[PDB]
């Protein structure tokens, strides 16, 4: 099925407090597996999933060097963009970088992406053709001009289509028993009478992986929904996720409402009622 290896890099400048803070996290699908935080004397790339301890000392040394070099490059990038926009030394600013692969069901490279953000807004983006760029403004056009001069898209195309795809295959094998094992949600409906006329029905989905899920309060046509609320999928803290959907129904119309749950770990979709 579809799989992705993603790196999310964040660099925030500290006015008057030293060098910028740099944090990098790596994901395989919805599983974080590595971290780098430069707020240390000797920061190292460290595993964030247990199956990554199967990698030797040189692997961690190489990623540690790659991450420390990136932190320095982002410190230069912060100074550069701050000069592009005529911004003072007193302002704290953020440069964000997401990078990675996506595989299709066929297992081969499907889509790559490399995007830059300055202060929470789009800045520089590599297009899906992996040969052109999109600059958000006049400043980012200078960065695009530098990227074309250095054949940056050519080097990114080789990383996104080859180096990144090969290591995603290596990570899916080491974390095989956890990455490729689908966890179906555990589902139940709760009932709380808001008043003598109406009642809340809440459909729960607990402990599922991956995060993609659909919770729907289906209805037989004759339900008179008074209110509804879906919550964002949230991490349970143990590698799995949670979600619930609620609906305010006239008391006496509970049976007209069914909860439909879709998830890759389910052999069939699940329907459940109070």
């Amino acid at each position: 099925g579809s799989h992705s290896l993603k790196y999310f890099h964040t660099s925030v400048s500290r006015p008057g407090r030293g060098e910028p803070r740099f944090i990098s996290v790596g994901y395989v699908d919805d599983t974080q597996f590595v971290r780098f935080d430069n707020d240390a004397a000797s920061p190292r790339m460290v595993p964030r999933a247990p199956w990554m301890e199967q990698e030797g000392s040189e692997y961690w040394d190489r990623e540690t060097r790659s991450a420390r070099d990136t932190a320095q490059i982002f410190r230069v990038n912060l100074r550069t963009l701050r000069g592009y926009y005529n911004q003072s030394e007193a302002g704290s600013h953020t440069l964000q970088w997401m990078h990675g692969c996506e595989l299709g069901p066929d297992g081969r490279f499907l889509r790559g992406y490399e995007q830059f953000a300055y202060d929470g807004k789009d800045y520089l983006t590599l297009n899906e053709d992996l040969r052109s760029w999109t600059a958000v403004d006049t400043a980012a056009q200078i960065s695009e001009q530098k990227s074309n001069d250095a054949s940056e898209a050519e080097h990114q195309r080789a990383y996104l289509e080859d180096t990144c795809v090969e290591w995603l295959h290596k990570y899916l094998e080491k974390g095989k028993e956890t990455l490729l094992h689908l966890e179906p949600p555990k589902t139940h409906v709760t009932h709380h009478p808001i008043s003598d006329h109406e009642a809340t029905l809440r459909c729960w989905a607990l402990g599922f992986y991956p995060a993609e899920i659909t919770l729907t309060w289906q209805q037989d046509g004759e339900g008179h929904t008074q209110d509804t609320e879906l919550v964002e999928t949230r991490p349970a803290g143990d590698g799995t996720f949670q979600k619930w959907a609620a609906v305010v129904v006239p008391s006496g119309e509970e049976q007209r409402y069914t909860c439909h749950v879709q998830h890759e770990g389910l052999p069939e979709p699940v329907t459940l009622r109070w």
Partner: peptide
């Protein structure tokens, strides 16, 4: 495996 940057913004 992350990518050591090649160019500057």
């Amino acid at each position: 495996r992350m990518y050591s940057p090649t160019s500057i913004l």
